[PDB]
């Protein structure tokens, strides 16, 4: 039973540069009869079946650009995307087909490395319709920013909230390579009517100081 470990899990490389992904096998995959390693490389994109890029460790499948190349022997293998392009952003898995059961790597995400961009921050109070049902959802929007890392701190009457909000990040935009984030604070209608100032404090690399957006309940 052969187990594969990829590294790194995430990889950011600038346009036109060289991306290298490593795949480690717990056991050799070398057939002696034909001196070839039985290791393959696959690419997958959202809503699409996996695409075979390289087999026999270093042989290119049809329909694969020349910039994809594989190498390695024994237990260390390498997928190399030279001159990284836009449509190369995908998840890459290494699969062994030496013997059954076939096994995959855990996956390696490859993204393009853009300049920092600060997020436009908005805040939305809960609707009057939702308040009749007894729940209150406060939404904070972080629009079109990079990088993805961004601390979002909810404040209710200047009290730091914890364990009552969920975050969600969009896919990297195709044209400007920016993400967008939504943080949603949830609390009961009773708890919502006890306090006045609902604030969303955003800390980001593109902001030299934390930007806060807030509203007073019913104004």
């Amino acid at each position: 039973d052969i187990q594969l470990t990829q590294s790194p899990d995430s990889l950011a490389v600038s346009l036109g540069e060289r991306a290298t992904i490593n795949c480690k096998s717990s056991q050799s995959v070398l057939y002696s009869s034909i001196n070839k390693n039985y290791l393959a490389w696959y690419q997958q994109k959202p809503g699409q079946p996996p695409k075979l890029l390289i087999y026999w460790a270093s042989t290119r499948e049809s329909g694969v650009p020349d910039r994809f190349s594989g190498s390695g022997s024994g237990t260390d293998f390498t997928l190399t995307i030279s001159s990284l392009q836009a449509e190369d952003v995908a998840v890459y898995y290494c699969q062994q087909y030496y013997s059954t059961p076939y096994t995959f790597g855990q996956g390696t995400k490859v993204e393009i490395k853009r300049t920092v961009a600060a997020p436009s921050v908005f805040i939305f109070p809960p609707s009057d319709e939702q308040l009749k049902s007894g729940t209150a959802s406060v939404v904070c929007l972080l629009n079109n920013f990079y990088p993805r890392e961004a601390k979002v701190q909810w404040k209710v009457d200047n009290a730091l909230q914890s364990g009552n909000s969920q975050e969600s990040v969009t896919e990297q935009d195709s044209k400007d390579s920016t993400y967008s984030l939504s943080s949603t604070l949830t609390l009961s209608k009773a708890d919502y009517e006890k306090h006045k100032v609902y604030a969303c404090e955003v800390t980001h690399q593109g902001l030299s100081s934390p930007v806060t957006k807030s509203f007073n309940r019913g104004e």
Partner: peptide, 21 residues
């Protein structure tokens, strides 16, 4: 338009927000 990926709330139900500037 930015329709965010859904997240599973602790109630087992999905929540989602779609915003436009």
């Amino acid at each position: 338009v930015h329709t965010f990926p859904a997240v599973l709330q602790s109630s087992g139900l999905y929540s989602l927000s779609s915003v436009v500037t």
